[PDB]
Amino acid sequence: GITGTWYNQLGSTFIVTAGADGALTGTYESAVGNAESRYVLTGRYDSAPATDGSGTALGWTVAWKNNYRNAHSATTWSGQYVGGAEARINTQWLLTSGTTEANAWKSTLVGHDTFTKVK
Amino acid sequence: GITGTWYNQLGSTFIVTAGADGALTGTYESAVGNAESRYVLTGRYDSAPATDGSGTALGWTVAWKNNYRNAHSATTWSGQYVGGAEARINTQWLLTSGTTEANAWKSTLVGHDTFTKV
Amino acid sequence: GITGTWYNQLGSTFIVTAGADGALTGTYESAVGNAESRYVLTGRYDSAPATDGSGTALGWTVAWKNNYRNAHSATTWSGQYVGGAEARINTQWLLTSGTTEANAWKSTLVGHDTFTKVK
Amino acid sequence: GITGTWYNQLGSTFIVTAGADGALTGTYESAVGNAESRYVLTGRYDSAPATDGSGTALGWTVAWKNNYRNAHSATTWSGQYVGGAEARINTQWLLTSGTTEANAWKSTLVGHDTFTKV
Numbered sequence: 421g422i423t424g425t426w427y428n429q430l431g432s433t434f435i436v437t438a439g440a441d442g443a444l445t446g447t448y449e450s451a452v453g454n455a456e457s458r459y460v461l462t463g464r465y466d467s468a469p470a471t472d473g474s475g476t477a478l479g480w481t482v483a484w485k486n487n488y489r490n491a492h493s494a495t496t497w498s499g500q501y502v503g504g505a506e507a508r509i510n511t512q513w514l515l516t517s518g519t520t521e522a523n524a525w526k527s528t529l530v531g532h533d534t535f536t537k538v539k
Numbered sequence: 540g541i542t543g544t545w546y547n548q549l550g551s552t553f554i555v556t557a558g559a560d561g562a563l564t565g566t567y568e569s570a571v572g573n574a575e576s577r578y579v580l581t582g583r584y585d586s587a588p589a590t591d592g593s594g595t596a597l598g599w600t601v602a603w604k605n606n607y608r609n610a611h612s613a614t615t616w617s618g619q620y621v622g623g624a625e626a627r628i629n630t631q632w633l634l635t636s637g638t639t640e641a642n643a644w645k646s647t648l649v650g651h652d653t654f655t656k657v
Numbered sequence: 658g659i660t661g662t663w664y665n666q667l668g669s670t671f672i673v674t675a676g677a678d679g680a681l682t683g684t685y686e687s688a689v690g691n692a693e694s695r696y697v698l699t700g701r702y703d704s705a706p707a708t709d710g711s712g713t714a715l716g717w718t719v720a721w722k723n724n725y726r727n728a729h730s731a732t733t734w735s736g737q738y739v740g741g742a743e744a745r746i747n748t749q750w751l752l753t754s755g756t757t758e759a760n761a762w763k764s765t766l767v768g769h770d771t772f773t774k775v776k
Numbered sequence: 777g778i779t780g781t782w783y784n785q786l787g788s789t790f791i792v793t794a795g796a797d798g799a800l801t802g803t804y805e806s807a808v809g810n811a812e813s814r815y816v817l818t819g820r821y822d823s824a825p826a827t828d829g830s831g832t833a834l835g836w837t838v839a840w841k842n843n844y845r846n847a848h849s850a851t852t853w854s855g856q857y858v859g860g861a862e863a864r865i866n867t868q869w870l871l872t873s874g875t876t877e878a879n880a881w882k883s884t885l886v887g888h889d890t891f892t893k894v
């Protein structure tokens with residue numbers, strides 16, 4: 421159910437393929453920030469979820485560098501997939517920028533994104 | 540400089556290989572929590588950091604399931620690599636557990652880990 | 658505009674009074690967790706906001722101990738007030754529990770709450 | 777044990793008084809960021825921690841505005857006090873800046889600070 425095209429509240433696009441071994445691979449296109457075009461993403465997910473009523477834990481990373489731009493930063497999203505008629509991935513994320521050692525204290529942003537599956 | 544064996548402050552070991560295009564691949568062994576043996580890890584890093592003096596942005600994920608246990612959770616570390624004599628990777632992490640909807644508010648833990656090659 | 662009664666998506670209630678010196682004082686009643694009745698809250702807010710189109714930065718803390726229960730934990734909410742016809746306080750929070758030194762790594766939860774002002 | 781003068785790893789000084797019912801009052805002086813002089817701080821702490829061996833839960837807020845500057849932001853630290861010979865306060869913090877709606881996604885920074893009386 422994870423595999424497919426998803427969009428978040430900002431208009432960003434997340435295209436992912438879930439592998440049988442727990443691997444997530446795909447491309448991400450961000451509606452905001454210092455980004456252009458597609459960026460490679462790689463992640464992991466729990467391929468043997470609990471079967472009560474719980475979500476599937478997962479996470480993925482994107483380094484903001486492709487052939488067109490490099491923002492010297494990486495974002496990791498951690499959250500869970502909640503399947504159903506209306507599938508959603510609720511996340512919390514951390515965006516770290518490469519900084520000198522003096523600005524290190526302000527290298528990391530934190531937010532939350534909710535993704536909606538197309539079709 | 541990233542490629543290698545790293546250890547954090549809790550006793551975990553992180554073995555990673557950094558590929559030429561920004562890929563991070565390896566295995567993780569946790570010292571705490573519901574965990575036993577190695578777990579596969581994957582991530583990405585800036586394979587062209589700035590030349591000022593800044594660290595190298597990176598991140599990776601470890602889903603806590605292997606052929607022995609499944610804690611139904613995944614951790615993502617976000618931080619930066621800083622080279623030099625005493626190379627370090629400073630990160631902050633988010634641990635999300637699969638939960639029912641009524642427990643989603645307390646699904647995520649947050650912490651910080653410092654990795655060194657010592 | 659901050660002063661008043663607010664509710665979040667979980668059904669929790671936040672009654673606050675904003676002082677002229679940047680102080681926030683009031684009571685909080687949580688719909689979830691190890692809590693019962695009212696808990697004292699104290700915080701600070703930027704009493705001289707930018708006047709472009711931006712929110713007002715603020716934060717407050719609640720220690721989960723009152724005369725009825727003690728959860729040995731404290732939550733701090735950090736966010737901004739966005740006034741208007743439909744006033745909202747968008748937050749991110751950290752809940753830390755007192756732990757032994759060995760469980761310290763798992764002492765802190767992180768989430769996000771959106772509050773809606775009544776009337 | 778909480779009452780006193782504390783310092784973090786960046787050079788900031790935290791002067792607090794802990795009241796009998798759980799109130800935290802004091803002043804903060806930052807060593808980094810847009811900041812100059814002391815800022816008022818208020819918080820709460822568990823005024824009846826458990827007797828096992830656990831730390832004391834606490835939190836406080838500092839709005840970054842005083843009679844000299846206004847960074848239009850507020851930081852909240854959440855963590856715990858651990859007594860003993862080398863008393864420490866370990867925390868994680870969230871720094872939110874007032875933003876326009878189109879910049880709300882990047883309104884909040886997150887970090888961790890360790891305070892000692894040294």
Ligand SMILES: O=C(O)CCCCCNC(=O)CCCC[C@@H]1SC[C@@H]2NC(=O)N[C@@H]21
Pocket residue numbers: 428430432450451452453454455484491492493495513515517531533881882
């Ligand atoms: O590098 C700094 O110091 C930060 C500068 C401000 C933002 C610049 N942009 C970037 O670094 C890359 C864009 C990241 C986009 C973010 S990741 C979390 C959030 N979700 C989403 O779909 N888009 C945003």
Ligand SMILES: O=C(O)CCCCCNC(=O)CCCC[C@@H]1SC[C@@H]2NC(=O)N[C@@H]21
Pocket residue numbers: 547549551568569570571572573574603610612614632634636650652762763
């Ligand atoms: O504390 C508990 O066990 C209940 C809370 C839910 C978490 C359950 N999941 C786990 O314990 C999975 C293993 C995570 C261990 C973490 S990842 C962040 C930190 N760094 C490290 O090297 N080990 C710990």
Ligand SMILES: O=C(O)CCCCCNC(=O)CCCC[C@@H]1SC[C@@H]2NC(=O)N[C@@H]21
Pocket residue numbers: 644645665667669687688689690691692721728729730732750752754768770
């Ligand atoms: O103490 C632990 O180890 C955690 C145990 C699980 C939760 C127990 N509950 C508590 O500690 C106190 C309840 C806090 C309520 C939280 S604060 C953040 C969130 N917002 C809101 O309106 N309610 C919840």
Ligand SMILES: O=C(O)CCCCCNC(=O)CCCC[C@@H]1SC[C@@H]2NC(=O)N[C@@H]21
Pocket residue numbers: 525526784786788805806807808809810811840847849851869871873887889
């Ligand atoms: O890096 C910048 O200045 C742009 C990012 C927005 C933040 C603007 N606000 C400030 O700098 C206000 C002062 C915060 C300083 C922080 S609070 C967390 C950390 N601990 C400490 O003792 N000082 C720093």
